[PDB]
Amino acid sequence: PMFIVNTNVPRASVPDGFLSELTQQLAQATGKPPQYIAVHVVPDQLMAFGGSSEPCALCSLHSIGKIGGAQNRSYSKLLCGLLAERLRISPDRVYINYYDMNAANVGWNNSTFA
Amino acid sequence: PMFIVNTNVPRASVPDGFLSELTQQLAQATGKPPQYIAVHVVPDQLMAFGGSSEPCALCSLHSIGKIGGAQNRSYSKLLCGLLAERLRISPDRVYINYYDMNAANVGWNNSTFA
Amino acid sequence: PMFIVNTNVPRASVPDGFLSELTQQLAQATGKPPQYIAVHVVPDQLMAFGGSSEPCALCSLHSIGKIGGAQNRSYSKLLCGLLAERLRISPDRVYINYYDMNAANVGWNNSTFA
Numbered sequence: 219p220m221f222i223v224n225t226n227v228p229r230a231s232v233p234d235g236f237l238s239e240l241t242q243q244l245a246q247a248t249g250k251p252p253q254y255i256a257v258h259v260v261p262d263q264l265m266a267f268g269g270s271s272e273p274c275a276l277c278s279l280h281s282i283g284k285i286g287g288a289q290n291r292s293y294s295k296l297l298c299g300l301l302a303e304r305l306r307i308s309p310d311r312v313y314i315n316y317y318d319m320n321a322a323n324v325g326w327n328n329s330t331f332a
Numbered sequence: 333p334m335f336i337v338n339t340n341v342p343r344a345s346v347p348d349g350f351l352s353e354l355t356q357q358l359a360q361a362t363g364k365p366p367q368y369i370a371v372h373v374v375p376d377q378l379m380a381f382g383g384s385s386e387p388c389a390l391c392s393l394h395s396i397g398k399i400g401g402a403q404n405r406s407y408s409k410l411l412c413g414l415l416a417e418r419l420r421i422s423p424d425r426v427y428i429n430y431y432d433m434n435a436a437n438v439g440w441n442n443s444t445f446a
Numbered sequence: 447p448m449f450i451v452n453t454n455v456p457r458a459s460v461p462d463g464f465l466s467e468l469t470q471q472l473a474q475a476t477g478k479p480p481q482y483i484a485v486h487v488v489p490d491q492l493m494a495f496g497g498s499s500e501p502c503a504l505c506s507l508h509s510i511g512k513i514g515g516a517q518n519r520s521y522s523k524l525l526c527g528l529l530a531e532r533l534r535i536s537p538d539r540v541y542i543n544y545y546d547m548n549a550a551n552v553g554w555n556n557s558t559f560a
């Protein structure tokens with residue numbers, strides 16, 4: 219799986235240990251082993267949410283399965299949670315895009331997962 | 333909705349109020365309220381369009397509904413217009429990807445839209 | 447077509463010509479004239495793959511058609527090769543998402559491809 223965060227929060231306010239935490243928490247929630255999880259944090263970004271430049275987050279989670287209504291509800295509770303706890307962003311200023319990828323449309327190790 | 337502009341144009345060339353104007357303009361066009369539109373500009377990027385590194389842009393608009401043939405056509409006139417006027421980028425060096433999101437696949441405020 | 451790669455490899459590890467080379471190789475592979483190919487490389491990124499900060503990369507390829515099982519396998523082999531040969535990234539630390547875009551959902555030059 220693949221989680222990307224884009225946030226107007228400056229790099230300094232991102233803790234050490236944050237990528238490891240995202241990695242272990244997403245592994246636990248998706249059931250995918252940590253070895254297959256990728257995280258990408260993008261601080262210091264030039265973004266607004268609803269006209270205002272208070273702290274915010276634009277994110278995405280791509281996964282081959284383990285995507286759907288109840289799972290996405292759960293994932294968003296877990297992620298908004300970490301973004302609030304660790305980056306002090308308020309959940310109503312977070313948007314997450316969820317992608318259920320087909321194995322044929324994901325490339326890895328010179329080939330695809332199909 | 334979620335709007336991102338990646339561009340090779342440098343930061344100093346992005347006018348102040350560009351985010352505001354995008355927020356306000358995407359609101360009118362989509363019919364979505366300004367307060368839920370989130371915008372994101374990424375300037376000073378290493379990119380090429382057509383082999384060339386003359387000014388160019390790659391955008392994306394994610395949205396639950398309001399994504400369709402005529403709407404997208406309307407949005408592209410609107411967003412190219414703005415990119416040309418304010419960033420001095422030629423429209424024929426702009427790609428916009430439109431994504432119509434299912435509500436269950438968009439997280440916000442500890443849950444999803446579904 | 448549109449190729450984006452984000453990597454925690456430094457700006458200086460990216461050799462000159464890389465964008466041009468991607469543009470050309472993607473023109474051949476996609477069967478599209480380079481006039482329509484856009485590439486975008488994002489070095490220095492804060493990211494992790496399998497919870498490790500060794501070199502890695504997260505890419506995507508967006509195209510109106512030209513996306514499918516046998517083709518994606520061929521893209522991956524081509525693109526993982528360029529990312530190994532030019533950025534010293536191990537192919538088992540590259541993920542590439544492929545997206546088959548509908549003409550109507552891609553904007554360019556004040557309009558859509560529809």
Ligand SMILES: Oc1ccc(-n2cc(-c3ccc4ccccc4n3)nn2)cc1
Nearest residue numbers: 313315333334364368394395396433438
């Ligand atoms: O990445 C995404 C995808 C979709 C959206 N999205 C938000 C909304 C939304 C939010 C609030 C609204 C309030 C009134 C009417 C429509 C509204 N639509 N629609 N699409 C946001 C981020």
